[PDB]
Scaffold this active site. Structure first.
Site, mmCIF file in Angstrom:
data_model
loop_
_atom_site.group_PDB
_atom_site.id
_atom_site.type_symbol
_atom_site.label_atom_id
_atom_site.label_comp_id
_atom_site.label_asym_id
_atom_site.label_seq_id
_atom_site.Cartn_x
_atom_site.Cartn_y
_atom_site.Cartn_z
ATOM 1 N N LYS A 45 41.182 30.464 -12.884
ATOM 2 C CA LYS A 45 42.645 29.850 -13.151
ATOM 3 C C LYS A 45 43.665 31.375 -13.058
ATOM 4 O O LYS A 45 42.807 32.265 -13.995
ATOM 5 C CB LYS A 45 42.970 29.128 -13.755
ATOM 6 C CG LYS A 45 42.349 27.710 -13.383
ATOM 7 C CD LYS A 45 42.933 26.650 -14.053
ATOM 8 C CE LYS A 45 44.631 26.590 -14.456
ATOM 9 N NZ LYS A 45 45.052 26.764 -13.440
ATOM 10 N N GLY A 46 44.175 31.387 -13.304
ATOM 11 C CA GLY A 46 45.861 32.598 -13.634
ATOM 12 C C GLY A 46 46.525 33.190 -12.061
ATOM 13 O O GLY A 46 46.529 34.585 -12.415
ATOM 14 N N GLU A 61 48.731 29.029 -19.849
ATOM 15 C CA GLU A 61 47.378 27.883 -19.152
ATOM 16 C C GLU A 61 46.544 28.104 -19.529
ATOM 17 O O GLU A 61 46.039 26.626 -20.360
ATOM 18 C CB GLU A 61 46.906 27.921 -17.472
ATOM 19 C CG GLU A 61 48.262 28.258 -16.730
ATOM 20 C CD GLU A 61 47.640 28.376 -15.582
ATOM 21 O OE1 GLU A 61 46.510 28.808 -14.530
ATOM 22 O OE2 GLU A 61 48.753 29.199 -14.770
ATOM 23 N N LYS A 119 39.913 24.260 -1.815
ATOM 24 C CA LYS A 119 39.767 25.014 -3.353
ATOM 25 C C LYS A 119 38.275 25.259 -3.853
ATOM 26 O O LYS A 119 37.971 25.385 -4.504
ATOM 27 C CB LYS A 119 40.333 24.045 -4.295
ATOM 28 C CG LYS A 119 41.928 25.102 -4.540
ATOM 29 C CD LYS A 119 42.914 25.952 -4.110
ATOM 30 C CE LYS A 119 44.407 25.547 -3.787
ATOM 31 N NZ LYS A 119 44.744 25.155 -5.577
#
Ligand code: NA
Ligand code: NA
Lengths: 238, 236
Positions: A100-101, A109, A127
């Site tokens: 993530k990010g 987050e 994904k």
């Protein structure tokens, strides 16, 4: 085949909002998939099907979106414990460990989702990865500005990520800066990280690193929308 | 007795500069003790006693000091491998694990000293502790600014330190800002930390933390000045 990526994202989002109940403090994720969940929560509040919701946003974009929908908002300083968080992911591995990010908001987050009793991750099936890094796209590391060239080389040479390429993220002429005035070094893999826990610890152990995009042992439920339908994957091996 | 704390600091500093040899890349510490060593390196260069030195500062303050002395300077980006680093410490335990950062510069000190083949720590003997945390004074943690109130409470409640007091470091009525634009939460213990390695891991594992003042398995030589004289302790 008929379902577009955006339609799949929205399907996953709506399924995830079913975990939101009236009275909850909800972590509101960031990105195009999460934006469908934010809009669904806002719709249900307007319709009276949800009540007494407070959202904690994870980005400026999410703050602005939720504000425009009339969702009551708070920060982690005000609501340090969240009942449910809904967010997307850049990659999802078979353990429901995620990257993530990539698009920003990495540390926010992570902090919000670490404060959440249940983290529901929403993705379209593009994904899914064999292992973290496997998308070949950026795996972000947030670093201090001081001696960022040194830290980038130090990262690229850590045994736990051996074989990666590392690039300082730029915003045109100037290095990109996070919400906390840090820089991002993006790591790029051609084969997945072999031991994600060891990589996480090694990266965090490097003086000069703030945090990184390996979100391990965090996701409790992953909702995956694909051509065949929507799968609800509880975290394997509980 | 007759020797003041400042005189002891300078004695330790001068002894430490003997480890600096012409040709070296040298990490330059921060704080009153280290400042005597920086001043001595600068003097020896001006006198021709040392040559071909490059210094790597651990703080904006030390950069400015070395600038004023004419010491050639670089950063880890240009000199990633240092021969010797000289710096002070807030606490020194029996194994030469130390607490640093009461002056605010823990992060850059840690980066510079981790890159140094020999880290010489200089103290007067008031800095010696039986166990880290045992001074009852600040064990600093550098944190991001975002939701720092939240991070301070999470820090205070980590199993490895739970029991301490935790305070956002202030510069008067405003929070203290480090050279890296971050805040510091100082942790205060009544008794030494149960397991410093475990405390290090847990603090570093907390999202929102940048780094902390536990410098473990780093110091190679500690030079201690006390009323009796100057002692040299190598890592057990
Ligand atoms: Na030379
Ligand atoms: Na300091």
């Amino acid at each position: 085949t008929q379902l577009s990526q955006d339609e799949l994202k929205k399907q996953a989002a709506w399924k995830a909002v079913e975990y939101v109940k009236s009275g909850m403090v909800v972590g509101l994720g960031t990105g195009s998939t999460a934006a469908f969940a934010v809009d669904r929560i806002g719709q249900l509040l307007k319709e009276g099907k949800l009540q007494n919701i407070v959202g904690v946003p994870t980005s400026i974009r999410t703050y602005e979106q939720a504000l425009s929908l009339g969702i009551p908002l708070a920060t982690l300083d005000e609501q340090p414990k969240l009942d449910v968080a809904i967010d997307g992911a850049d990659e999802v591995d078979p353990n429901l460990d995620v990257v993530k990010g990539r698009g920003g908001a990495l540390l926010r987050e992570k902090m919000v989702e670490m404060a959440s009793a249940k983290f529901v991750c929403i993705v379209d099936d593009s994904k899914l990865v064999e292992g973290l890094g496997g998308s070949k796209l950026a795996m972000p590391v947030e670093i201090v500005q001081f001696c960022h060239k040194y830290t980038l080389q130090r990262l690229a040479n850590l045994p736990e990520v051996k074989g990666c390429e590392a690039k300082l993220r730029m915003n045109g002429d100037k290095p990109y800066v996070t919400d906390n005035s840090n820089y991002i070094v993006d790591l790029y893999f051609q084969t997945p990280i072999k031991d994600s826990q060891a990589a996480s610890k090694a990266i965090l152990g490097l003086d000069g690193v703030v945090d990184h995009g390996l979100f391990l042992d965090m996701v409790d439920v992953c909702i995956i929308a694909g051509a065949t339908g929507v799968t609800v994957q509880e975290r394997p091996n509980p």
